[PDB]
Amino acid sequence: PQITLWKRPLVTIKIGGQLKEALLDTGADDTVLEEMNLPGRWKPKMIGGIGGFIKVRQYDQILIEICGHKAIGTVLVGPTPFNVIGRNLLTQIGCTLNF
Amino acid sequence: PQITLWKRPLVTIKIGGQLKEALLDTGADDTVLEEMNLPGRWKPKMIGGIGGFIKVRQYDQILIEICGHKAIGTVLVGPTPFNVIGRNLLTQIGCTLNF
C-alpha cells in the first residue's frame, strides 16, 4: 500500500504469535520493540537513540509479519518509547520512500 | 524520486541559507536539526526517543528545501546526533511510504 504521513505510520504487526502496534520508522536502522517475552536465545546489546543509549536483548532470525508481509531478521527488545520497525525489516517487505 | 532503505535515507536540505544532510524520518513527528544559530524567537521544548529526552529550541514557519521541494513549518534545534526531517515537513513535499 501507499501510506501518507499526516498521522503516524502505525501498523499492526504479528510476532511470536501476538499482535502489536508498531511505527514504520525510516530513521531507525534497527527494529526495537517494547518489553515482551520472545522465544529463543538472546544476547545483551546496546542501541543509541536521540536521548542516549539503552540496554536491549537482541533476538536474531525472528519472524515478524507487517501488514501481511513477512520478514525474518533481528529484533531488539528493550525500553523504547514505541515499537519501531526499522530499515532491517522495512527492506525485507520492500518498503521505499517516494515523493 | 524513490528512495530505498538499504542505507540511511540521507538527502541534502537547504535551511536558513545553508546546505545540510538530513534523514527522511517517518518515525519523527517533527523536524529536528543539529545545533545551529537561527535568528528569530523560539520556544523551549523537550522531545523524547530511545535513550530519553533532549532539550530543543522550537522555531516556527522555517523554510526548508528538501531535494528541490520547498516546505515551511516547525523546526526544532538542539543536540540531536542527526538532522531528521519529520512528518510535519514530509507531508508537505508529498512523501509516502510504499510497499
Ligand SMILES: CC(C)CN(C[C@@H](O)[C@H](Cc1ccccc1)NC(=O)O[C@H]1CO[C@H]2OCC[C@H]21)S(=O)(=O)c1ccc(N)cc1
Ligand atoms: C524513536 C522514534 C519513535 C522517534 N525518533 C525518530 C527515529 O527515527 C530515530 C531517529 C534517530 C536516528 C539516528 C540517531 C538518533 C535518532 N531513530 C532511532 O532511534 O533509531 C535507533 C534504532 O535503530 C538505530 O538506528 C538509529 C538510531 C537507532 S527520535 O529521534 O527520538 C525523534 C522524536 C521526536 C521528534 N520530533 C523527532 C525525532
